[PDB]
Design a protein around this ligand. Structure first.
Ligand SMILES: Cc1cc2nc3c(=O)[nH]c(=O)nc-3n(C[C@H](O)[C@H](O)[C@H](O)COP(=O)(O)O)c2cc1C
Ligand code: SF4
Ligand code: SF4
Ligand code: SF4
Ligand code: SF4
Ligand code: SF4
Ligand code: FES
Ligand code: FES
Lengths: 229, 59, 212, 117, 431, 33
């Protein structure tokens, strides 16, 4: 039934259709990512997914290209690494120098994957851009500057929230996902966007500055605020 | 802090392993299940199509 | 033009009323007739032209109005009005000069066309004149590269302008409607005056096409 | 270079340098430091209770190096033995005072040393 | 032809008379040309032999892609799947160095219309969608008029000039979207979606506008196609080198005595049309050192390799140059080049939207780097670092705008490196 | 003289005139979001 495709060496009974992402993630190998999300929707922007197929003339988008038989995927192969280096050199080419004041800066995914990949030294020599702040709610402060044109948040917002106030604005340099007009975004699941932000762009106001992730214990249970349990 | 032992933490290769430790050591325990997320079918075009009412919008 | 956000709410268009003419309703409905019934959205881009065609500028009232028209969320109209530069979100003068300075014209010293326009008007290029008429601006390649510098004034293509010819254009702008050709040096229909080689035979009869 | 009594210190403007980045809390090998960062009414990140006890400080002087904003400084002073244990468990307050008395000196030494780091 | 001899071309070899506007662009002028010839009879209710006529035509992409249009159009022999099929025509004409698609629409809509009819039939298309620039308003009205003349004659509309194959064109316009010059960006433009191109796990052939399957082609290919289907496409295949079968518009431009557009045999030497149709550059051909093939996108050509190259794109590929719709911008030596290429990359930065990060950031960055270069402030080694940036842009960017964004400065490095260093030394001497 | 010298409103009107010539648009299927 299932199509066969090779992870680096091992043959894999991968599902018909399905992305290279889920293929590598079946053997447990894990592709670097940002804009993609596991229960959202694929988007081609921010190509951190780049990998070369064994016979590939040039690298494919692992989070998106459907698997098919006869392919082989050396995730550890050098060219893929050059690709990821290509992503990280660029994301940081204009990122704000504010890890320390970032509420996400103690745990930002951009950091972990900055450690996993990208040259240790940078070669900036000019003047980075920085957008103005853009309030969209009392309980969800948005520093911006930090958002990486990754569009996971609009695909959350426009869809599951059902509200569409959020979205892209402009093109070329100084393009921004800052929502049009002053009006606040509002939703009954307004807060979840905070979680979904890869960086510190969407830091919650009430929790702001309060703490740093490593210090915290993570005691588990269930809420009773909803009957949803 | 009250209880001295409170910061203890212990990795295990398997569940029966941890159960075996709490049994060897005499403490009571509560087993909990693994939570691998269920697989989700996904495709680039699934976002589109006029009929499927996925559509999304501008991109 | 960094003000993509429109965070500002100028009294010029906070909730200032605006409405299309009935003819415009007929036109946009005709556009709905141009496109499949399941998606009104194909019509979004054209309506914004018409909304501006009535004005030469797009108030936010026009934006949420059009959003009401095609029954789609306003953010669509915002994103599309924004992404596409030809729409003008700042009110303009009677003319919208948009001279190219792109390299094919830059070699043709289009920049001289620019200093000519400035020295004539005294405008700092992009600023609106107090006169509320001229609105000079540099623009990327309009795709008439083969000829010369061009000054597309409100879709009035002009080419081969000399600074004196620019004197003629600007003075004529106050004088009346302008002829709207290709090259102004004397050539027309892109045809070089130096040889006019290429095609040479007039006929092109419906022949040779027999194949079988 | 010499390491000694700690002191928080200000901007030339007279604002405190501290931003509560709380990595100096992540480094103090004896974990003497304790920090509760909270928002300013002005909105800026600010410690509400920075504190350190010299009883557990090992004067490795990591924090002098670790701070991104160069907030806390291991000052010149060394002579400050006390009659009682309590006088050792410093609040942010005492540290600020220490940065007050020695700021000329501290800034002077940093003026001597800063290239090496 | 088969020989090294080139620069030859019969006027009646041209598919395109009234290229320059003479002899009436009005439909009556098309009739004087007898353009509707056997156009009704081409519709024998089965593609194949016309589609094969184009496969045998040797014809390839006129979008600058150079991709075999017969095979490209072969894709929609497929069953319609119950979703209506459409043909989208690329008329963006926003690309630099390119005035070729302008005068043709201004002076010969009709052959293109017959191309929409024949090629639209080949696709089994329900319609014939056609994009227009917002810069192109007046011209959109001219074409709308000629299309209305096509309606009144019944040559289009229901059944369309007999045969019984229903055929309605649909004129479409945009606004400032140069990126819609990319095909899928334009396909995105049709839904009212912003013109940021799709990644393609599915090809446009598989899914088109509104989810209903579609297709695209450049104006040149689709306009030549009906004549391919009438006059033998093998006759089209005879010109130039075999892979470079047919003819191509040659837009000589920039510093030259007589800049012009001239459709011509694919494989004329590049210097020839300069010495002929262009009339030669001012100060003579000897002044030339940098003249670029392609629409201000493909890498620069030095005069030494320039003498040898034939206008057909394969000769350009041996010159390490892409087709680029074979636009030609001459650049006289007296002017600085680095300012020009910097202006070009600036042209990219203004127009690259910025969906996938690597190209957005890559151009936003490489531009500023170029500003540092042109100002001369830059260190000599820095340019090599720009090359690295280029390497991270090319195969990574989701679309080819970044490729042409990268290439010209790659050429400026590769040839004008000593020139760069020479420029930097002068800034070094000011102190 | 010029091939083009049109009114600002002209295009949509020329568009509307040919609307009678249009074959009906597909309803596709789903219509209301
Ligand atoms: C007028 C025009 C402008 C184009 N602009 C671009 C562009 O900016 N970037 C790009 O990658 N492709 C561009 N293309 C090529 C498209 O990506 C597409 O492949 C092409 O239009 C189809 O060529 P064909 O019709 O010869 O198959 C352009 C094509 C045309 C006709
Ligand atoms: S977002 Fe992640 S990376 Fe950017 S600043 Fe906050 S922490 Fe440092
Ligand atoms: S919030 Fe800012 S950063 Fe997080 S996804 Fe939306 S845009 Fe990218
Ligand atoms: S030094 Fe100031 S800023 Fe650095 S961690 Fe200790 S408190 Fe936070
Ligand atoms: S002095 Fe040495 S030990 Fe005490 S805090 Fe600063 S670094 Fe940690
Ligand atoms: S790659 Fe850069 S330019 Fe090509 S489409 Fe994606 S964003 Fe626009
Ligand atoms: S992982 Fe989502 S596109 Fe790279
Ligand atoms: S190059 Fe400036 S308009 Fe074509």
């Amino acid at each position: 039934n299932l199509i066969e495709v090779f992870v680096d060496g091992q043959s894999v009974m991968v599902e018909p259709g399905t992305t290279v992402l889920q293929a590598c993630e079946k053997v447990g190998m894990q592709i670097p990512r940002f804009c993609y999300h596991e229960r959202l929707s694929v988007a081609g922007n921010c190509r951190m997914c780049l990998v070369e197929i064994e016979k590939a003339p040039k690298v494919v988008a692992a989070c998106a290209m459907p698997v098919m038989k006869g392919w082989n995927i050396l995730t550890n192969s050098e060219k893929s690494k050059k690709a990821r280096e290509g992503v990280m050199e660029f994301l940081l080419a204009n990122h704000p120098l504010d890890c320390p004041i970032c509420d996400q800066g103690g745990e930002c995914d951009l950091q972990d994957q900055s450690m996993m990949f990208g040259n240790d030294r940078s070669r900036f020599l000019e003047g980075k851009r920085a957008v103005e702040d853009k309030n969209i709610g009392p309980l969800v402060k948005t520093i911006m500057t930090r958002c990486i044109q990754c569009t996971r948040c609009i695909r959350f917002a426009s869809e599951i929230a059902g509200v569409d106030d959020l979205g892209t604005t402009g093109r070329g340099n100084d393009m921004q996902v800052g929502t049009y007009i002053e009006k606040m975004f509002m939703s009954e699941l307004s807060g979840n966007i905070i979680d979904i932000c890869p960086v510190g762009a969407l830091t919650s106001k009430p929790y702001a500055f309060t703490a740093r992730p490593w210090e915290t214990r993570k005691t588990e249970s269930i809420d009773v605020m909803d009957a949803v349990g | 802090t009250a209880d001295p032992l409170s910061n203890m933490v212990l990795t295990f290769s398997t569940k029966e392993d941890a159960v075996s430790f709490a049994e060897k050591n005499g403490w009571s325990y509560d087993i909990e299940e693994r939570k691998v997320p269920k697989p989700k079918s996904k495709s680039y075009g699934a976002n589109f199509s006029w009929n499927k009412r996925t559509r999304v919008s501008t991109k | 033009g960094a003000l993509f956000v429109h965070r500002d709410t100028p009294e010029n268009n906070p909730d200032t009323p605006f409405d299309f003419t009935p003819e415009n309703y007929k036109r946009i409905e005709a556009i709905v007739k141009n496109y499949p019934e399941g998606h009104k959205a194909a019509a979004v881009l054209p309506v914004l032209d018409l909304a501006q065609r009535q004005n030469g500028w797009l108030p936010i009232s026009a934006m949420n109005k059009v959003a009401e028209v095609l029954q789609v969320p306003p953010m669509r109209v915002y994103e599309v009005a924004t992404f596409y530069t030809m729409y003008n979100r700042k009110p303009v003068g009677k003319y919208h000069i948009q001279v190219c300075t792109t390299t094919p014209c830059m070699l043709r010293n289009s920049d001289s066309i620019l200093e000519a326009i400035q020295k004539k008007l005294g405008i700092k290029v992009g600023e609106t004149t107090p006169d509320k008429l001229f609105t000079l601006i540099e623009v990327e390649c309009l795709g008439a590269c083969v000829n010369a510098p061009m000054v597309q004034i409100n879709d009035n293509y002009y080419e081969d302008l000399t600074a004196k010819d620019i004197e003629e254009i600007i003075d004529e702008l106050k004088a009346g409607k302008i002829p709207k050709p290709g090259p102004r040096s004397g050539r027309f229909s892109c045809e070089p005056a130096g040889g006019l080689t290429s095609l040479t035979e007039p006929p092109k009869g419906p022949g040779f096409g027999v194949q079988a | 270079r010499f390491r000694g009594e700690h002191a928080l210190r200000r901007y030339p403007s007279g604002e405190e340098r501290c931003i509560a980045c709380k990595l100096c809390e992540a480094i103090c090998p004896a974990q003497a430091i304790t920090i509760e960062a909270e928002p300013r009414a002005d909105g800026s990140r600010r410690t509400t209770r920075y504190d350190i006890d010299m009883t557990k400080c090992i004067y490795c002087g990591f924090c002098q190096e670790a701070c991104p904003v160069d907030a806390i400084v291991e000052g010149p002073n060394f002579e400050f033995s006390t009659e009682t244990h309590e006088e050792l468990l410093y609040n942010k307050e005492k540290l600020l005072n220490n940065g007050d008395k020695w700021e000329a000196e501290i800034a002077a030494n940093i003026q001597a040393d800063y290239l090496y780091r | 032809p088969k020989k090294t001899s080139f620069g030859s071309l019969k006027d009646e070899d041209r598919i395109f008379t009234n290229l320059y506007g003479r002899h009436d662009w009005r439909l009556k002028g098309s009739l004087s040309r007898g353009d509707w010839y056997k156009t009704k009879e081409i519709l024998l209710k089965g593609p194949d032999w016309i589609l094969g006529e184009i496969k045998t035509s040797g014809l390839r992409g006129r979008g600058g892609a150079g991709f075999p249009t017969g095979l490209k159009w072969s894709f929609m022999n497929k069953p319609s799947d119950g979703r209506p099929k459409y043909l989208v025509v690329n008329a963006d004409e926003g690309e630099p160095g390119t005035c070729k698609d302008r005068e043709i629409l201004r002076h010969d809509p009709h052959k293109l219309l017959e191309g929409c009819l024949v090629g639209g039939r080949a696709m089994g298309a329900r319609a014939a969608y056609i994009y227009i620039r917002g810069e192109f308003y007046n011209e959109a009205s001219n074409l709308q008029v000629a299309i209305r003349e096509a309606y009144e004659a019944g040559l289009i509309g229901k059944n369309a000039c007999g045969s019984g194959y229903d055929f309605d064109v649909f004129v479409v316009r945009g606004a400032g979207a140069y990126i819609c010059g990319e095909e899928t960006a334009l396909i995105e433009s049709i839904e009212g979606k912003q013109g940021k191109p799709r990644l393609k796990p599915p090809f446009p052939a598989d899914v088109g506008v509104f989810g209903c399957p579609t297709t695209v082609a450049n104006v040149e290919t689709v306009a030549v196609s009906p004549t391919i289907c009438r006059r033998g496409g093998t006759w089209f295949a005879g010109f130039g080198r075999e892979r470079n079968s047919g003819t191509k518009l040659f837009n000589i431009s920039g510093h030259v005595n007589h800049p012009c557009t001239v459709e011509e045999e694919m494989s004329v030497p590049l210097k020839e049309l300069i010495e002929k149709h262009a009339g030669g550059v001012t100060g003579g051909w000897d002044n030339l050192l940098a003249v670029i093939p392609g629409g201000s996108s493909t890498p620069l050509i030095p005069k030494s390799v320039c003498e040898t190259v034939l206008m057909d794109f394969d000769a350009l590929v041996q010159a390490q140059t892409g087709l680029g719709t074979a636009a030609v911008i001459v650049m006289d030596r007296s002017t600085d080049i680095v300012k020009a290429i910097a202006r070009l990359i600036e042209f990219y930065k203004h127009e690259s939207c910025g969906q996938c990060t690597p190209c957005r950031e890559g151009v936003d960055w490489m531009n500023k780097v170029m500003a540092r270069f042109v100002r001369g402030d830059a260190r000599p080694a820095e340019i090599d670092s720009l090359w690295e940036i280029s390497k991270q842009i090319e195969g990574h960017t989701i679309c080819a705008l970044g490729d042409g964004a990268a290439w010209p400065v790659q050429g400026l490095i590769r040839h004008f490196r000593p020139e760069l260093e020479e420029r930097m030394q002068r800034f070094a001497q000011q102190h | 003289l010029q091939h083009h010298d049109y009114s600002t409103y002209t295009f949509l009107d020329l568009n509307l005139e040919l609307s009678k010539f249009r074959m009906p648009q597909p309803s596709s299927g789903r219509e209301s979001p």
